[PDB]
Design a protein around this ligand. Structure first.
Ligand SMILES: Nc1ncnc2c1ncn2[C@@H]1O[C@H](COP(=O)(O)O)[C@@H](O)[C@H]1O
Ligand SMILES: Nc1nc2ncc(COP(=O)(O)OP(=O)(O)O)nc2c(=O)[nH]1
Length: 158
């Protein structure tokens, strides 16, 4: 099954964190990376006195179950999601989200697939669109259609 994973990091200098995350995604068992989007630079949500985010999309081929895949992405967030600040480990700055999982719809305590708010977020839609422009959601909506309708600006690359 082809799973699409969103990556976000709002570290001040996130390239190594994001690359460590990508390698970690590549090491998940029963799975392999098919494609990775460009890296984009996006302003954060809420107030603008915060660091920008690096966002990207990853296509992962996997024979894991959705919630097993979620165990792995949450494990990576726990192991790699904090950078060591001088006196301590800093706040988590890495987000890994399952946007789509094959054509499946999932509504569990732990997992909402398609991602619960991706259609509001160009920083999720545009990286996905770069690696799956023809994508159709389980319910028949089309990724192209959502971007056309909302007209979210194209993102700047990192
Ligand atoms: N598609 C998804 N991808 C990643 N986390 C998800 C998803 N759907 C629901 N979640 C839940 O979202 C929470 C986000 O955790 P956190 O990143 O610490 O804010 C987790 O507790 C997950 O169980
Ligand atoms: N530009 C950009 N802005 C963002 N703002 C908020 C969240 C995180 O959203 P969510 O998990 O839904 O909730 P919370 O921010 O409270 O963790 N992620 C990004 C991101 O990836 N890129």
């Amino acid at each position: 099954t082809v799973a699409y994973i969103a990556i976000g990091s709002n570290l001040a200098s996130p390239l190594e964190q994001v690359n460590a995350a990508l390698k970690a995604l590549g090491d998940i068992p029963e799975s392999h990376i098919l494609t990775v989007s460009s890296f984009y630079r996006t302003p954060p949500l809420g107030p603008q006195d915060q660091p920008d985010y690096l966002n990207a999309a990853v296509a992962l081929e996997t024979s894991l179950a959705p919630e097993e895949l979620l165990n792995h992405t949450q494990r990576i967030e726990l192991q790699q999601g904090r950078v060591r600040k001088a006196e301590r480990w800093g706040p988590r700055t890495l987000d890994l989200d399952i946007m789509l999982f094959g054509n499946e719809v999932i509504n569990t305590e732990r997992l909402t697939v398609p991602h619960y708010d991706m259609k509001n977020r160009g920083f999720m839609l545009w990286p996905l669109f770069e690696i799956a422009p023809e994508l159709v959601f389980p319910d028949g909506e089309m990724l192209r259609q959502i971007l056309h309708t909302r007209a979210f600006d194209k993102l700047n690359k990192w």
